[PDB]
Design an enzyme around this catalytic site. Structure first.
Site, PDB file in Angstrom:
ATOM      1  N   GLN A  13     -40.717  11.064  -4.822  1.00  0.00           N
ATOM      2  CA  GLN A  13     -39.924   9.876  -5.127  1.00  0.00           C
ATOM      3  C   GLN A  13     -40.776   8.739  -5.683  1.00  0.00           C
ATOM      4  OE1 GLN A  13     -36.400   9.984  -4.190  1.00  0.00           O
ATOM      5  NE2 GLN A  13     -36.168   8.227  -5.570  1.00  0.00           N
ATOM      6  N   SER A  94     -44.495  14.086   0.065  1.00  0.00           N
ATOM      7  CA  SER A  94     -43.141  14.021   0.647  1.00  0.00           C
ATOM      8  C   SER A  94     -42.249  15.114   0.031  1.00  0.00           C
ATOM      9  CB  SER A  94     -42.565  12.618   0.473  1.00  0.00           C
ATOM     10  OG  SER A  94     -41.344  12.496   1.200  1.00  0.00           O
ATOM     11  N   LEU A  95     -41.384  14.756  -0.921  1.00  0.00           N
ATOM     12  CA  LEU A  95     -40.634  15.763  -1.674  1.00  0.00           C
ATOM     13  C   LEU A  95     -41.591  16.794  -2.284  1.00  0.00           C
ATOM     14  CD1 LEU A  95     -39.825  16.517  -4.905  1.00  0.00           C
ATOM     15  CD2 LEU A  95     -38.184  17.010  -3.069  1.00  0.00           C
ATOM     16  N   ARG A 119     -31.791  17.428   1.947  1.00  0.00           N
ATOM     17  CA  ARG A 119     -32.760  16.497   2.537  1.00  0.00           C
ATOM     18  C   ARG A 119     -32.455  15.046   2.140  1.00  0.00           C
ATOM     19  NH1 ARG A 119     -37.927  14.492   0.955  1.00  0.00           N
ATOM     20  NH2 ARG A 119     -39.539  14.308   2.598  1.00  0.00           N
ATOM     21  N   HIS A 203     -40.037   8.628   6.335  1.00  0.00           N
ATOM     22  CA  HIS A 203     -41.300   8.676   7.090  1.00  0.00           C
ATOM     23  C   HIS A 203     -41.381   7.562   8.121  1.00  0.00           C
ATOM     24  CE1 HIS A 203     -42.119  11.865   4.381  1.00  0.00           C
ATOM     25  NE2 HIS A 203     -41.933  11.059   3.356  1.00  0.00           N
ATOM     26  N   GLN A 252     -42.603  15.975   9.240  1.00  0.00           N
ATOM     27  CA  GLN A 252     -42.891  15.206   8.030  1.00  0.00           C
ATOM     28  C   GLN A 252     -41.891  14.072   7.822  1.00  0.00           C
ATOM     29  OE1 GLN A 252     -41.544  15.639   4.182  1.00  0.00           O
ATOM     30  NE2 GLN A 252     -43.505  16.267   3.257  1.00  0.00           N
TER      31      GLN A 252
END
Length: 314
Positions: A13, A94-95, A119, A203, A252
């Site tokens: 992102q 992340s992604l 997600r 997060h 995560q």
């Protein structure tokens, strides 16, 4: 075979843009084919969205995530078809960790695209626009930011959400608490602090329930043994077996991305060259700040792709 000094990293992102990969796609029919495959899993035409917009939807995380996953996998397939050196390790932000797992053959592209659409949906529902915020804090010491977050929290949540490089931490949580943290930073002299446009406090503890939903979504899919190990964000380690990889993905979501840690882990394992496999040059910028000796190169554009393919010729 495998190049022991090379790693690939996949963006997340923030790295998306209207027209991302347009120029590479003109040269390589595989790119739009990969997007079409991902789109079947995601339930949305990711190439049409990423090229034509609307940008407002492209920037909404339930769409950004499968779009960026498709984009990273498209560049991965290009490199691997064009006889680029095979990396010895993977990671992603992340992604991007999901993109890495698709590149490693753990998940099919179809399933990966479906999973990250879910997600994004779970994350968005956890924090409807207005509830959450994220902010980048630049050029401060980690300790200053961490103590500020604790002081600002009150009855709400504000925590480090990304450790991106020395002098870049992203904080996140309840909007009011992020704003309080920003105020405290300002009264302490830390001025380089900008609220991000994202509505989703990834997060952070606000994602704890979304993480359980994510875990259930993952457990319905087929998980395969990785062909290349993936250094995961939650603890900057490779995890062994399906259960452990999935648990690290659940964790995560509500714990900080240890991006500095992941890059240091790569370097400690003999990596000297890192390709950013997907749009933008954000991770390459972070890597240059983390470890100035690493040869970090984006692959997002014809010239950068050709440059890397040439400089690392096998």
């Amino acid at each position: 075979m495998t190049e022991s000094t090379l790693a690939f990293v996949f963006p997340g992102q923030g790295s998306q843009s209207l027209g991302m990969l347009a120029e590479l796609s003109e040269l390589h029919p595989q790119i739009r084919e990969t997007f079409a495959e991902a789109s079947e899993g995601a339930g949305v035409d990711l190439w049409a969205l990423s090229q034509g917009g609307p940008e407002e939807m492209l920037n909404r995380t339930e769409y950004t995530q499968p779009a960026l996953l498709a984009a990273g996998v498209a560049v991965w397939r290009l490199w691997t078809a064009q006889r680029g050196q095979r990396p010895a390790l993977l990671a992603g932000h992340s992604l991007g960790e999901y993109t890495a797992l698709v590149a490693a053959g753990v998940l099919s592209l179809h399933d990966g695209a479906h999973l990250v659409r879910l997600r994004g949906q779970f994350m968005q529902a956890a924090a409807p626009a207005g509830v959450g915020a994220m902010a980048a804090v630049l050029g401060a010491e980690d300790a200053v930011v961490l103590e500020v977050c604790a002081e600002a929290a009150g009855s709400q949540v504000v925590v480090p959400a990304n450790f991106n490089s020395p002098g870049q931490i992203v904080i996140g949580g309840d909007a009011a608490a992020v704003d309080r943290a920003l105020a405290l930073l300002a009264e302490r002299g830390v001025r380089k602090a900008v609220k991000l446009a994202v509505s989703v406090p990834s997060h952070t503890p606000l994602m704890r329930d979304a993480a359980n939903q994510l875990g259930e979504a993952m457990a319905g899919l087929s998980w395969h043994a990785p062909q290349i190990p993936v250094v995961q964000n939650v603890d900057a380690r490779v995890h062994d077996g399906s259960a452990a990889i999935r648990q690290a993905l659940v964790e995560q979501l509500y714990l900080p991305v240890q991006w500095t840690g992941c890059v240091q882990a790569l370097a400690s394992q003999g990596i000297t060259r890192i390709a950013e496999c997907g749009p933008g040059k954000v991770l390459s910028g972070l890597i240059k700040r983390i470890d100035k000796s690493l040869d970090a190169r984006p692959l997002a554009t014809p010239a950068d792709y050709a440059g890397a393919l040439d400089a690392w010729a096998h």
